[PDB]
Amino acid sequence: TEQVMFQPGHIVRGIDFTEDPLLQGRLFSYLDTQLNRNGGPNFEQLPINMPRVPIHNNNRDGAGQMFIHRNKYPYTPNTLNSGYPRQANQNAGRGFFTAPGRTASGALVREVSPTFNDHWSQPRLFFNSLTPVEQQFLVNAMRFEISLVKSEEVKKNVLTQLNRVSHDVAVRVAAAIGLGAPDADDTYYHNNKTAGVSIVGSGPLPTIKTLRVGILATTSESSALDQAAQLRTRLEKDGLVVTVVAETLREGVDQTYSTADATGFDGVVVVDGAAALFSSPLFPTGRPLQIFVDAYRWGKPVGVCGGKSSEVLDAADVPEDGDGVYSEESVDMFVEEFEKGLATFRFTDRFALDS
Amino acid sequence: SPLAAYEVDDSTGYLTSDVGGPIQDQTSLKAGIRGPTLLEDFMFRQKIQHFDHERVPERAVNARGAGAHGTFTSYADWSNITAASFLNATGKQTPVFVRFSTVAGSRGSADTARDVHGFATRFYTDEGNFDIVGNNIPVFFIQDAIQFPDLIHSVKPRPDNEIPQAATAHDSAWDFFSQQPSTMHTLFWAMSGHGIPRSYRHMDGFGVHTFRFVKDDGSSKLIKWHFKSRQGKASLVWEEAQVLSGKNADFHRQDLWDAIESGNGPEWDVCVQIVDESQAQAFGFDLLDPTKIIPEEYAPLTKLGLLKLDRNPTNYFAETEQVMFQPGHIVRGIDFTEDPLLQGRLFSYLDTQLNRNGGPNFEQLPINMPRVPIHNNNRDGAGQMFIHRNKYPYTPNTLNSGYPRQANQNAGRGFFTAPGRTASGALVREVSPTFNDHWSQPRLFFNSLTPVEQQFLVNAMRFEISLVKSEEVKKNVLTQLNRVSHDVAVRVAAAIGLGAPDADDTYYHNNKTAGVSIVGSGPLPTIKTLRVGILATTSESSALDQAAQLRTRLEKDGLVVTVVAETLREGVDQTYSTADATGFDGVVVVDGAAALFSSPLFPTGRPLQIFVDAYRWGKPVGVCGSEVLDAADVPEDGDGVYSEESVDMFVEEFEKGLATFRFTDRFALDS
Amino acid sequence: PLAAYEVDDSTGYLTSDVGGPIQDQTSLKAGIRGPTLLEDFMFRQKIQHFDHERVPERAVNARGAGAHGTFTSYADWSNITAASFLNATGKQTPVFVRFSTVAGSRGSADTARDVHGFATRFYTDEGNFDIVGNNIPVFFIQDAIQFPDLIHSVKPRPDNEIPQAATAHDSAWDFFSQQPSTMHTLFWAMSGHGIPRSYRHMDGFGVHTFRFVKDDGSSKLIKWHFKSRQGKASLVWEEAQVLSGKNADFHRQDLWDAIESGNGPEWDVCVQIVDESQAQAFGFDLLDPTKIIPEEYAPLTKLGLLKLDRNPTNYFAETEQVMFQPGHIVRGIDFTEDPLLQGRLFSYLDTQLNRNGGPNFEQLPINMPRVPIHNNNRDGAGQMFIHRNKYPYTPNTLNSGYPRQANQNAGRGFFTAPGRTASGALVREVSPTFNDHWSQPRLFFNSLTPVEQQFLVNAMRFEISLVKSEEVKKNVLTQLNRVSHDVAVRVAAAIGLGAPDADDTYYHNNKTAGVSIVGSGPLPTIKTLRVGILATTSESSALDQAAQLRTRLEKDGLVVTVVAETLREGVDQTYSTADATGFDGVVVVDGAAALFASSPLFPTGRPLQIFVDAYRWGKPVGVCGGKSSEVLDAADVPEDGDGVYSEESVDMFVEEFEKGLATFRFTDRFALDS
Ligand code: HEM
Ligand code: HEM
Ligand SMILES: [Ca+2]
Ligand SMILES: [Ca+2]
Ligand SMILES: [Ca+2]
Ligand SMILES: [Ca+2]
Ligand SMILES: [Ca+2]
Ligand SMILES: [Ca+2]
Ligand SMILES: [Ca+2]
Ligand SMILES: [Ca+2]
């Protein structure tokens, strides 16, 4: 992984470049930068970089040269090696070839094409295509980052650009930084949308295999660990990755409260045998409840399994009838409902919106 | 062998990039037929990038050299003196690679420079690579490794103008020699024919330092490595070496390559002198001192095995340029000594390879790989070619069950420091007083040379010191030479118009030692590979007939025959224009060519000058079939001068001449 | 010039690189006969440095030597170029020049037969401008992508790395005969241009067509030609072979010495200037680097004087580390679509990463400009600057918009010639206008003198006789025959093959000025030329003669070496170390006549050999004193021979001998094919 050295210059017959000036310059950079990383010119000889076909060429020597070349006439044209290696091109040897319809005309220029000049319509197209909560998250990311910019001039300049994409984005972002948004400039504003760029709108996940479920239990009650073992079995059958959390390790418990965190899970379940936990030298004060509260605040499916739920849900300020909040005595029923929540993945009705 | 797996065949196939994409490489991609070249041309950039990065730093010293592969075969089970696995059974064979080199010249300098020579041998043993990084001279200029940059800066070109190339013939070098008297012994060797060997095959190999042989019972003895050439000892003469440096900079590397290609691969008996630890100061000097030899009179040679070089490299850069030797490549059964020159060497080779290779994985290059499994916790680094399966590369571990396991005197045939070794005293930057005699052994060496040999060494010093501009340095040089031999001081002083200092007899003596003279080592044991130039003419069908008759005879006796004439044709190898006496070990003029001794086809007098140069330089010379000998002012009665009508008779005599190799009576001596 | 970076060690105690005083002569050991200690930091820092002294040699032109100097413009050249270094009569700009061979490694001999580099850096007030040229105006190949093919073929065979610094081997001649574009440069290399007498006696060429661009955007096509003020001179090959052995450092020493004596070499920096409309008007393509513009079609314009007058202080730091680039270009100059030039632009910037081992090679003193640098290049190994601007990106407001963009209209920016265009398919195709590989080789050959043509035939005979492959030799004769049937026949005769039937397609009888060495006439100056005076310590009068000649010769700027059996006052060299290749002219004092008729002090026949060699190689030779027959007879040299002198009078001898030094070579001494 550290030594793999990719290049857009690693192209094959059947593919060609375009005159995208970003692409064009990349072709130089990767070949050159590999000299930096590898410290010499024979980086294509590292195992991870080698091809899976024979190499025939007249490249020689260089630091770290791993081949012993038999051909002692590595120049073209030659007779002393019978004209080998032979040239490959469109008509012989399945050579790479530049698309033959490609042309260039005009002055040799350091000029930008005016066709590149619309920097704002597509940002607006992308924004228009996000759902309302998704638009809010984007506004909030901008509010977070721009509020950390110290220069008032830079912040003003940022609002000027954002406003060219969307007046509303500029207004909402300005609100957090205590500046005024400039007046609407409608040149590039439009209402068009495009498919397949939204995450929130992309629907439930097609598979929940690998998703992580944290089961918060206790060693204080044999009943709680029995619940967690049963839940584990039912969940693991479906390819979910189960972590049972308790105060200390023992058979069946994967993780102590001290090392556990809501970020370790895609869904969190409390077994009702553990309701009492919701201070100790074994974990920070309030840790078990905070794992549940965090998972809820971050949109994850959360639930209590066993039939007794009000104690836990009330301590966590989590409404029993919320979307993505589960309570069932039946392990089977609990898991069936919970797995729907995992595919839904995030319950976005837990996030405030600008009005 | 690591090398077979990495050989790449390009005898068939379409050209590809390094990542296997078929491409072309003859025309740049352009915006129109007369247009500018495009940055998107990856074919151009990958090819030019590789070319732009072909070169690597030359070796800090010994940059000019050539290598070959071969085999070492043990003569015995040497258990009784060493635990070394490669020496543990009669007939046991180990692959070797050897590089020979000069020392001061950069990588494109002439082979026939006057210099110390490197003789570095890698034994790819079944218990690790073992390197003996030796020289063709048994003693070194300096007594402490820390002085190496001083010696080498003084011998290498002056740093303002990088003049002169591959030569000690300048002020700085002789300033160093005259200020650092330890240099005298190696200097005498370099100023002898040992500085200009006839080939790599006609020189011996020496480890220089005292090492230890260590037995499995922990006992040790002190040893000197001496590789004894089976081809004999032979030198050029200095004027021939100078001409050679211009006419064939590649002379030694060509000589070696050709010998191998012809099934005449060079051999050495790999030998040691072996003495007890108690004898470290028993011979009148300290065996930790790398400026001293053990005279053979005090310790004879034990023949351990045969070294044969019999395969050339496939790719010079990948094998010869990239081989990276280290005296730190040691194996169980061998140890170091407290020789301060050897001690510091240990650090230098490991570090300098980072410079050449540009990263730390230089032992992964095929030529540097061992021939046994590697088990260690070395990881990562630029150019990492392995994919290590062990994800717990730390010791001690339980998560990899304790592997790799520690090897030591009692486990896993580990290396171990000789257990009888000790250290005692202050931590000092002081030179042992036992190292202080810088002059007796140079005198021993000089005494041991034949009179003409002593003349040649004197003439070498006369040549070089006359090129020293500084009057003060010249005087200092005579001061030191005079401590070795008053006569050497006198004779050298005469050439530079200075007076020698009065005799200082402190270190004078009349002792001699066997095995250091070239001139005295007798005729060569074989003449195979030696070169005969037959000077002929296209004028006379009879000249060509004569030449071809000589050729049949001489080639059956293993000699390399070159028939020279005005122009090439069937049976003629070389034109006069490209021919030179330095190309030959013997010269024969065929009777029919007597006329040649002006043409637009070669320089005026070239045919005669080849014959005259060969005679002046001491070679066997002859005419097969009066006038030629008169023209060349060569006496018909001369030793190593042949004059016969009978081809068989001529061949028989001439071949004795080739064994004698040099007729030293052609050289004037001081009286 | 680089004074700020000099370090003086003429006084003081030894220190580490961090200024701690230390010693460096004995290792630290556990006891006086003990093992060396790892804690010996004095040892490790010294030896680490030594271990890492070397850097990769240049991929080509590894063997070379450099000096500092000054360029002076002759005029304000505004009317043809915006280049600031050319914008005022008398304007001076510091330069550094490196001269080189091409194929040999470091340590190979100066006097190998080869193309030679002539790379000039102008440290201009608008940036460093490099002209990375050669001593031959045309190059072997027509596309940069072919460079590794040419260089692999010329460099040593890669199994044994043989032969050093030579085209005289199969691969080279295989490549030349398979790639006929090579013929022009090949003919130049086989002429005296392949073995120049010194770096000072050769010219410099940019090779490619470039553009001169005016501030108004208009452009003209130019060829750069640095015309030597020392004259043109070559060695003969046999002499060159001996020199390679006797003095591998010959050209570097010659240059070093000329500068130290106050005879720094000079060139007129010239251009041929033509209109863009003339790119195809001369019967060949100006984009084609295998073609010269005959001077009859476009005369040379003298732009200014280049003079080298200061040697480096440290060869490694200055000469070894200087890193030229044709991409070091300045406002007022631009490139052309020459496909050889085009790819070179990439190569030099990349290859310096190899040599320097890091990206900040422009910060080495020798590579620095003499004007402020303002850019947003940052970090990288070996970063020597401490940049204050903490906003190194454009566009910025946080650094007020600095550095500002420079272009045609502001800040005196470089700009591409605005009339330049491209048109057509993106192609890996050679222009048919490049296809004539033979007419110019023929024009060149036709322009040489008869003995010069013989020398070139003989170079080819020498090299091609060493090619082992019969098929390569036959292919070589096929290509040479397309240039000249007579050349093919004459070369063929040495290798015992038949030349193919005449093919007259590209034969012609046209000639061009300024390409012949032999025809360029006597040297305009004899200052620095070397005279060896052969004497004897056996006769006090021979020493007196040598001394009187010394005075007379040295007065005229000649470098005089007196040779005798042994050194003493007034004798510079012994016979043992003397050689005819060390001299441009040889004089025997008649008091020394007896040595020309055995000694432990030099090789048998040495004194006579020096005289005979000098004669055979065409040099002026003579005897001073009145008694010349003994020496001249022994040397088989005729008294009435041109370039052979015999006078009693020291004054008269020197006047005649000096005319001979300017003639330089007496060509009547060389046999010609019938
Ligand atoms: C007994 C005295 C010594 C002998 C016989 C010796 C022998 C050699 C030989 C034969 C080589 C070339 C190996 C090859 O062919 O690649 C070499 C290289 C080298 N030597 Fe030593 N040497 C000696 C002393 C030293 C000392 C004292 C130092 C430094 C403290 C030293 C540092 C080097 C370095 C830096 C190289 C280049 C190695 C490489 O690039 O792989 N030498 N020496
Ligand atoms: C018109 C033809 C050319 C001329 C006159 C030319 C001239 C030179 C000169 C004079 C040097 C040595 C500069 C110095 O003294 O440091 C040099 C080095 C070099 N050249 Fe060129 N060259 C030409 C074509 C090329 C081409 C086609 C390539 C590759 C595409 C190339 C790649 C190099 C490289 C890699 C070096 C070593 C540069 C360095 O290490 O700094 N040359 N050339
Ligand atoms: Ca193509
Ligand atoms: Ca010096
Ligand atoms: Ca000898
Ligand atoms: Ca063991
Ligand atoms: Ca070859
Ligand atoms: Ca000439
Ligand atoms: Ca590096
Ligand atoms: Ca521009």
What is the Cα–Cα distance from C145 to B24, expressed in whole angstroms?
Answer: 10
Q: Give the neighbours of chain B: at least 3 Cβ pairs within 8 Å.
A: A, C
CA of B374 to the centre of ligand 2 (A): 43
Between strands C92-100 and C64-73, the pairing is antiparallel
Q: How far lies C217's CA from each of B436, C77, C81, C213, C214, in Å?
A: 77, 15, 10, 6, 5
* Paired strand residues for C587: C533, C622
- Comparing C-alpha atoms, which of A90, A83, A10 is closest to residue A43? A10
DSSP run (H or E) holding A271: strand A267-271
A278 in Cβ contact with A270 (< 8 Å): yes
Q: For C1-426, give the CATH class.
A: mainly beta
Nearest ligand, measured from the Cα of B406: 6
| Backbone phi, psi, residue C131, to 5° | -115, 105
Q: Which of B116, B133, B180, B351 to mutate to test the pocket of ligand 1 (most atoms within 8 A of CB)?
A: B133
Number of alpha carbons in the 13 Å side-chain half-sphere of residue C313 = 11
Quick check: helix, strand or coil at residue A300? coil
Backbone angles phi, psi at A234, to 5 degrees: -60, -40
How many beta carbons lie within 10 A of that of residue B510, not counting itself?
7
Nearest CA among B261, B208, B195, B202 for reference residue B230:
B202
Beta bridge partners of residue C228, listed in sequence order: C267
The first and second tokens of residue C283, run together, are 């019967």
Determination approach? X-ray
Chains that touch C (3 or more CB pairs under 8 A): A, B
- H or E element, residue B476: helix B471-484
Cite the DSSP H helix spans in chain A.
21-38, 121-128, 132-146, 152-165, 167-177, 222-236, 287-297, 310-315, 331-344
Two tokens at A55?
A: 């190499």
Q: Which chain C residue's Cα is nearest to B599? A: C671
The residue ranges of DSSP E strands in B102-200, in sequence order, are 118-125, 128-135
Q: How far apart, in whole angstroms, are the C-alpha atoms of residue C446 and residue A335?
A: 98
Cα-Cα-Cα-Cα torsion B428, B431, B433, B439, nearest 10 degrees, comes to 180
Q: Which fold has domain B527-671?
A: Rossmann fold (3.40.50)
Only one residue has tokens 């501009």, namely B469
Closest CA to C610 of C638, C585, C629: C585
Mark the breaks in chain B: residue after which each occurs, C to N over 2.5 Å. Answer: 597, 625
Question: Which CATH number applies to B1-427?
Answer: 2.40.180.10
Say which CATH class C427-525 falls into. Answer: mainly alpha
For ligand 1, atom 4, name the residue with the nearest CA.
B134
Question: Edge-to-edge strands of the sheet including C559-564?
Answer: C573-574, C559-564, C530-534, C585-589, C621-624, C644-647
d(CA B414, CA B331): 9
Resolution of the determined structure in angstroms stands at 1.5
**Spatial CB neighbours of B320, under 8 Å, sequence gap ≥ 6:** B65, B66, B67, B99, B313, C161
Residue A59 alpha carbon to ligand 2 centre in Å: 18
Q: Of the candidates A303, A335, A298, which has an alpha carbon nearest to the alpha carbon of residue A322?
A: A303
Inspect the interface and report whether the beta carbons of C152 and A74 lie closer than 8 Å.
yes
Interface residues from chain C to A (CB-CB < 8 Å): 148-150, 152-153, 157-159, 170-171, 174-175, 178-179, 350, 353-354, 359, 397-398, 407, 416-418, 420-428, 469, 471-472, 475
Report the greatest alpha carbon distance in chain A.
90
Cα(C403)–Cα(C392) distance, integer angstroms: 9
What is the b/e burial string over B647-657, where b = at least 16 CB atoms within 10 angstroms of the residue's CB? beebbebbbeb
Task: Provide the residue type at C585 as one letter.
Answer: G
Rounded Cα distance between A180 and A172, Å, is 10
B312 to C160: CB separation less than 8 angstroms, yes or no: yes
- Selection from C494, C518, C56 nearest residue A40 by Cα: C56
C591 touches C213 (CB < 8 A): no
What is the CATH number that goes with domain B428-526?
A: 1.20.1370.20
Which residues are found with C-beta within 5 Å of the ion, ligand 10?
A: A 110; C 415-416
Q: Is B343 in the pocket of ligand 1 (CB under 6 A)?
A: no
For C574, phi then psi, to 5°, come to: -85, 160
Cα–Cα nearest to B609, from B622, B625, B597: B597
Per-residue HEC secondary structure of B219-254 comes to CEEEEEEEEEECCCCCECCHHHHHHHHHHCCCHHHH
Q: Are B133 and C33 in contact (CB under 8 A)?
A: no
Say whether C213 sits in a helix, a strand or coil.
Answer: strand
Per-residue b or e along A85-109, where b marks 16 or more CB atoms closer than 10 Å to that residue's CB: bbbbbeeebebbbbeeeeebeeebe
β-strand pairing of C530-534 with C559-564: parallel
Ligand nearest to the CA of C163: 7
C324 half-sphere exposure, CB direction, 13 A CA radius: 27
Superfamily of chain region C526-674? Class I glutamine amidotransferase (GATase) domain (3.40.50.880)
Mutate to test the interface with B, among A11, A27, A48, A68 (most CBs of B within 10 A): A68
In whole angstroms, what is the distance from residue B526 CA to residue B658 CA? 9
- Nearest one of C333, C272, C267 to C127, comparing CA atoms: C333
Q: Which pairs count as long-range contacts for A321-324, CB under 8 Å and 24+ apart, including other chains?
A: A322/A347, A322/A349, A322/A350, A323/A347, A323/A349, A324/A299, A324/A300
Tokens 């075969």, residue?
B73
Tokens 């200061």 correspond to: C310
CA distance C183 to C185: 6
How far apart, in whole angstroms, are the C-alpha atoms of residue B25 and residue B427? 63
The DSSP annotation for A84-95 comes to PSBP-BTTBTT-
Can you tell me the distance from the alpha carbon of C324 to that of C332, in angstroms, rounded to the nearest whole number?
A: 19
The architecture CATH gives domain A109-207: Up-down Bundle (1.20)
The residue to which tokens 């080498």 are assigned: B152
The verdict on domain A208-355 having CATH code 3.40.50.880 is yes
- At A292 the three-state DSSP class reads helix
Can you name the residues that pair with C424 across neighbouring β-strands?
A104
In angstroms, the CA B467 to CA B448 distance is 28
DSSP reduced 3-state for C454: helix
Q: How far apart are CA C215 and CA B614, in angstroms?
A: 69
Distance CA C241, CA B243 (A): 8
- Alpha-carbon distance B258 to B29, whole Å? 44
Placement of tokens 């661009």 in the chain: C213
Cα(A309)–Cα(A305) distance, integer angstroms: 8
Distance from CA of C337 to the nearest CA of B (A): 5
**Nearest CA to B39 among A24, C143, A104?**
A24
